[PDB]
């Protein structure tokens, strides 16, 4: 379908959010209309936030599907996350001409328990 999604917003990478709380990323399609193209995503629990990010433990996953604006999609955890460091990893779909990269990471997001 010649779609082309990039991460345009997310849960803020600065600071630490009191847990448990959901995490999200917004993807903007700047290509042709997303039709049946499958952009797989994974929410990883990381060991650390050092760059470039490293694959961790996949906590949740899915495919980009929920349209929230004319060319805007949102991915959001259905669990609320426990304390930790996390990031979304979004893979290119079958047929995509991967020149730069086969995936895109969000910036990392941190949660910690406040009420103890």
Task: Spell out where 3-114 has E strands.
Answer: 5-10, 16-18, 24-29, 40-46, 57-63, 66-69, 72-76, 84-91, 103-105, 109-112
- In angstroms, rounded to a whole number, what is the distance separating the alpha carbons of residues 14 and 9? 13
* H helix or E strand, kind and range, residue 102: none
User: Are the C-beta atoms of 24 and 116 separated by less than 8 Å?
Assistant: no
Q: Is the dihedral of CA 42, 110, 83, 20 positive or negative?
A: negative
Q: Reply yes or no: is the peptide bond before residue 26 cis, omega within 30 of 0.
A: no
Burial 82-108 (b: 16+ CB within 10 A, else e): eebbbbbbbbbbeebeeeeeeebbbbb
Residue (of 116, 113, 110, 102) closest to 45 by Cα position: 110
**Left if phi > 0, otherwise alpha if psi is -120 to 50, otherwise beta: which for 88?**
beta
Distance CA 29, CA 78 (A): 23
Question: Strand, helix or coil at 5?
Answer: strand
CA distance 36 to 73: 14
């Amino acid at each position: 379908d010649q779609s082309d999604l990039h991460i345009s917003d997310q849960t803020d990478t600065k600071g630490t959010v009191c847990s448990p709380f959901a995490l999200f990323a917004v993807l903007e399609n700047t290509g042709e209309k997303l039709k049946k193209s499958k952009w797989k995503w994974e929410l990883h629990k990381l060991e650390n936030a050092r760059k470039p990010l490293k694959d961790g433990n996949v906590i949740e996953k899915g495919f980009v599907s929920n349209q929230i604006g004319d060319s805007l999609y949102k991915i959001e955890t259905k669990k609320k996350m426990k304390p930790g460091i996390y990031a979304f990893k979004v893979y290119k779909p079958a047929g995509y001409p991967a020149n730069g990269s086969t995936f895109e990471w969000s910036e990392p997001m941190r949660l910690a328990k406040c009420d103890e």
